[PDB]
Amino acid sequence: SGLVPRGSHMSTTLAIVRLDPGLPLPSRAWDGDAGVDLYSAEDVELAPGRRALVRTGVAVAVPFGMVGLVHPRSGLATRVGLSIVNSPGTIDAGYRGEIKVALINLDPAAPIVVHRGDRIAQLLVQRVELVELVEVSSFDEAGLASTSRGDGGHGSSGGHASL
Amino acid sequence: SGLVPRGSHMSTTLAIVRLDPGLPLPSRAWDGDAGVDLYSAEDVELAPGRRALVRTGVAVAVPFGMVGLVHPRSGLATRVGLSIVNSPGTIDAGYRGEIKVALINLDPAAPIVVHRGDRIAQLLVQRVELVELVEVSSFDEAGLASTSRGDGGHGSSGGHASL
Amino acid sequence: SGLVPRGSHMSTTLAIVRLDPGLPLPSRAWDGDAGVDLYSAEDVELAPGRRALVRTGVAVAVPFGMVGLVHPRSGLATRVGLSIVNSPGTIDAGYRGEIKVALINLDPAAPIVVHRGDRIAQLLVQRVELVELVEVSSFDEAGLASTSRGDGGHGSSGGHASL
Ligand SMILES: O=c1ccn([C@H]2C[C@H](O)[C@@H](COP(=O)(O)NP(=O)(O)OP(=O)(O)O)O2)c(=O)[nH]1
Numbered sequence: 001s002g003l004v005p006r007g008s009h010m011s012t013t014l015a016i017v018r019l020d021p022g023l024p025l026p027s028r029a030w031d032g033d034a035g036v037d038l039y040s041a042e043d044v045e046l047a048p049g050r051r052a053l054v055r056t057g058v059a060v061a062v063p064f065g066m067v068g069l070v071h072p073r074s075g076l077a078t079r080v081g082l083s084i085v086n087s088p089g090t091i092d093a094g095y096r097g098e099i100k101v102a103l104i105n106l107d108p109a110a111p112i113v114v115h116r117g118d119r120i121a122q123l124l125v126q127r128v129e130l131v132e133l134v135e136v137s138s139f140d141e142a143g144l145a146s147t148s149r150g151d152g153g154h155g156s157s158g159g160h161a162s163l
Numbered sequence: 164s165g166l167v168p169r170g171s172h173m174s175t176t177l178a179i180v181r182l183d184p185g186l187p188l189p190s191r192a193w194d195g196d197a198g199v200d201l202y203s204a205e206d207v208e209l210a211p212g213r214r215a216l217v218r219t220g221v222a223v224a225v226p227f228g229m230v231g232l233v234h235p236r237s238g239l240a241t242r243v244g245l246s247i248v249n250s251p252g253t254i255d256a257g258y259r260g261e262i263k264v265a266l267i268n269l270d271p272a273a274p275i276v277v278h279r280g281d282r283i284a285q286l287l288v289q290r291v292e293l294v295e296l297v298e299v300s301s302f303d304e305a306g307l308a309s310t311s312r313g314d315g316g317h318g319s320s321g322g323h324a325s326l
Numbered sequence: 327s328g329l330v331p332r333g334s335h336m337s338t339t340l341a342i343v344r345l346d347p348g349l350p351l352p353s354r355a356w357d358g359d360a361g362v363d364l365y366s367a368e369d370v371e372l373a374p375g376r377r378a379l380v381r382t383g384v385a386v387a388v389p390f391g392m393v394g395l396v397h398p399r400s401g402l403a404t405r406v407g408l409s410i411v412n413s414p415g416t417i418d419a420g421y422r423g424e425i426k427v428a429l430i431n432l433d434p435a436a437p438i439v440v441h442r443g444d445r446i447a448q449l450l451v452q453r454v455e456l457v458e459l460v461e462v463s464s465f466d467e468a469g470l471a472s473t474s475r476g477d478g479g480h481g482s483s484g485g486h487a488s489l
Pocket residue numbers: 152153154155156157158192235236237238239285396412414415416417418419421424425426427428
């Protein structure tokens with residue numbers, strides 16, 4: 001266990017505080033999984049269309065040059081219509097507060113009951129480009145070549161009757 | 164074609180099985196596009212507020228150290244209110260099942276009809292940090308410096324009358 | 327200021343055009359923040375359940391090999407139920423049009439008023455794998471080893487009463 005394998009030499013460490021020590025540390029369900037599952041610290045009942053800001057019982061220190069991303073779980077999304085209002089939740093490198101999850105019930109009729117200790121979201125960590133904006137008067141002025149896509153967006157490639 | 168250009172030497176391959184061989188391979192609409200468009204294998208009609216778990220007809224092997232991400236298309240989102248309940252859908256490196264898309268109709272009044280062969284989502288592949296949690300009693304105890312953001316979140320920087 | 331610190335040597339530049347020069351350049355709220363906040367160029371009022379495609383007053387040139395990602399802000403999400411229909415919005419490297427934000431009001435009862443100059447979303451820039459699909463008849467045929475997760479998905483790991 002204690003030996004870092006050569007193919008894991010460069011894997012990143014994430015400092016975590018269990019603000020609620022009664023919950024397990026977040027973990028990957030299976031080897032290779034993109035995220036660690038976040039627990040609810042709280043019981044909450046969401047009627048259709050209602051949202052709540054739910055405590056996870058953890059704080060993390062995302063490294064500088066990275067971002068933490070809070071994603072919904074697919075099973076709850078399909079089974080009961082559970083989603084996250086601000087998905088993907090964007091955890092900044094400087095944030096030292098508790099991670100909170102903005103759960104919302106997108107089912108039209110059935111309430112969702114979350115219990116303390118349920119796994120209600122997943123946390124990924126990725127590098128992010130901390131970009132330096134360069135203001136230009138036009139892309140042409142910036143010596144950028146014309147692109148194939150150009151200003152095409154919002155369904156310009158087709159693929160559905162409404163587009 | 165067959166020659167990998169020097170600037171593409173390190174581009175990653177993604178093994179894909181067309182579980183439904185009647186659909187085209189997912190493709191980028193234009194050069195440089197972030198994602199390949201996923202097809203619906205199925206006809207489905209979503210009344211306002213309803214969701215479905217839609218088959219794409221594909222399975223992929225996301226490489227270890229990466230994640231597949233299922234995003235909504237912008238044109239359908241604006242034009243008809245189509246969204247994805249668990250967006251961004253998180254495809255794990257170990258997953259060998261069919262990719263499924265949790266479509267939802269967020270329009271209040273008009274149903275959305277999806278036909279087999281429509282492009283209903285897009286799949287991105289990115290590296291992900293497979294983090295090693297390091298539990299600490301406090302960030303200070305971990306020798307982390309105080310940050311500018313501190314525990315500020317959830318609108319702490321302002322920028323709207325409600326914040 | 328003008329000196330790039332050694333730890334920022336490789337930070338990426340992003341060309342930006344202020345199509346609406348009356349708005350500030352997007353900025354990070356705090357050092358290390360993952361995204362730059364996008365402004366609304368427009369006044370818009372969203373009744374419950376309504377969406378709009380809102381102009382930000384900017385165009386960017388995301389570098390080839392990268393993607394721009396439009397995420398909701400957490401404070402507005404919780405406080406007033408503001409979300410983005412296609413979140414995370416996927417800005418392609420070839421796109422040279424105006425960035426637009428598909429705001430939606432997920433509150434059941436209270437309208438959301440956005441004013442020109444409000445910060446209504448955040449833009450991240452990340453690398454993306456421009457994948458080369460390799461079609462195979464089965465993962466076994468491709469010499470891929472069996473995985474722990476296998477075809478498990480959509481709540482297969484449990485963690486809620488509904489799963
Ligand atoms: O939030 C967004 C998302 C996309 N866009 C623009 C830039 C992007 O490159 C372009 C296409 O985005 P999508 O591929 O996500 N939407 P869709 O597939 O419907 O459009 P197209 O057919 O043009 O690819 O639309 C925005 O302005 N805001």
